[PDB]
Write a protein that binds this DNA or RNA. Structure first.
Ligand SMILES: [Mg+2]
Ligand SMILES: [Mg+2]
Length: 342
DNA sequence: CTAGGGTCCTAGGACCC
DNA sequence: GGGTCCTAGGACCCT
């Protein structure tokens, strides 16, 4: 009863697309991200930039101090979406059991697959080869009996490689696996776990489930399970989008309501256009706004509302502005919609 | 020197039983 | 007192 889960993950996805479409960028350090003047961060970088230490989520000013010749690109999201659609179609030739996690990656459940003599290793290789053949982009892959191990495995032989974890290999793999490598164990959790002496899954194996539940709630059960290779989450091909957001960080903090309202007037048409792609009648469950202050505190305020409405968003932003700003500058303004349940 | 697109979990009071 | 809804905040994920 052992499943075969493949995780496919494009290499340096945004950058890889820009090097394909502009071979001049292949061998110089490049990154997709907002400029230092826009107070941007790196979305991703190519391997020439990563050699300097450039990483996703790094402030662009930090990226540029590490790599002064870094070439900064704005991003062509329709080009990324197009490659995404293509690889998802390539996935469908092998199975309908496809759970995309983002543009550039998906889980595949090939447990019941007839391709490649049922070899999940050979399927992942065919899929990566096909992606290369048809998109001239490389992908890496992980093969394992459960989702999270497959996702970890796809990083281990990046780029343009794959890694297989068999059930017999699972205990040795877990023993020294850093907790931080588990998807959903982030910096804050890893630091909490570290300060109680828990660094690896092998450390957590020596822990009592009851203690983990008291100390972390349902997250503690997840930690206990994962540390044992337990991950019963099924590949789910039926997930639906729940929200639509549009937000902008300004190059300088704003201090006047007039400036905030001007920002919203430019954000609203974009929110309407994106909502309309998925809900032509603009019917929604909730709408709301987001402010981020100069001290990086963030507040949202959102409410039940039947249909995207600009004036109510301005009104709500005005209340938030007046009521929760306390004289701080504002670096970000955002609009938000929660979609109806079906 | 700190983005923009999101999902999920938690938690208190409201409301309903 | 128990469910569920409403709401805000925050960890976390991808690039
Ligand atoms: Mg990737
Ligand atoms: Mg990915």
């Amino acid at each position: 009863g052992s499943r075969k889960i493949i995780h496919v993950d494009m290499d340096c996805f945004f950058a890889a697309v820009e090097m394909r479409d502009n071979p001049a960028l292949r061998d110089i350090p490049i990154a997709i991200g907002g400029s230092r003047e826009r107070r941007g961060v790196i979305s991703t970088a190519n391997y020439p930039a990563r050699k300097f230490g450039v990483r996703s989520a790094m402030p662009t000013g930090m990226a540029l101090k590490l790599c002064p010749h870094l070439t900064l690109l704005p991003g062509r999201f329709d080009a990324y979406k197009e490659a995404s659609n293509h690889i998802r179609e390539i996935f469908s030739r092998y199975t309908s059991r496809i759970e995309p996690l983002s543009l550039d990656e998906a889980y595949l459940d090939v447990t019941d697959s007839v391709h490649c003599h049922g070899s999940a290793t050979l399927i992942a290789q065919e899929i990566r080869q096909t992606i290369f053949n048809e998109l001239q982009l490389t992908a890496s892959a992980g093969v394992a009996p459960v989702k999270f191990l497959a996702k970890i495995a796809s990083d281990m032989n990046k780029p343009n490689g794959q890694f297989v974890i068999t059930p017999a290999e699972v205990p040795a793999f877990l023993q020294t696996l850093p907790l931080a490598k588990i998807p959903g164990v982030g910096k804050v959790s890893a630091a909490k776990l570290e300060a109680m002496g828990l660094r690896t899954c092998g450390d957590v194996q020596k822990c009592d489930l009851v203690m983990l539940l008291k100390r972390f709630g349902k997250f503690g059960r997840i930690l206990w399970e994962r540390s044992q290779g337990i991950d019963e989450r099924d590949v789910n091909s039926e997930r639906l989008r729940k929200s639509v957001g549009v937000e902008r960080t300004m190059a300088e903090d704003i201090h006047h309501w007039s400036e905030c309202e001007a920002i919203i007037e430019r954000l609203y048409p974009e929110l309407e256009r994106r909502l309309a792609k998925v809900k032509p009648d603009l019917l929604i469950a909730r709408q709301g706004v987001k402010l981020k202050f100069d001290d990086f505190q963030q507040t949202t305020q959102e409410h039940v509302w039947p249909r995207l409405n600009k004036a109510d968003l301005i009104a709500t932003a005005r209340k938030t502005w007046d009521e929760r700003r306390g004289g701080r500058g504002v670096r970000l303004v955002g609009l938000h919609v929660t979609l109806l349940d079906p």
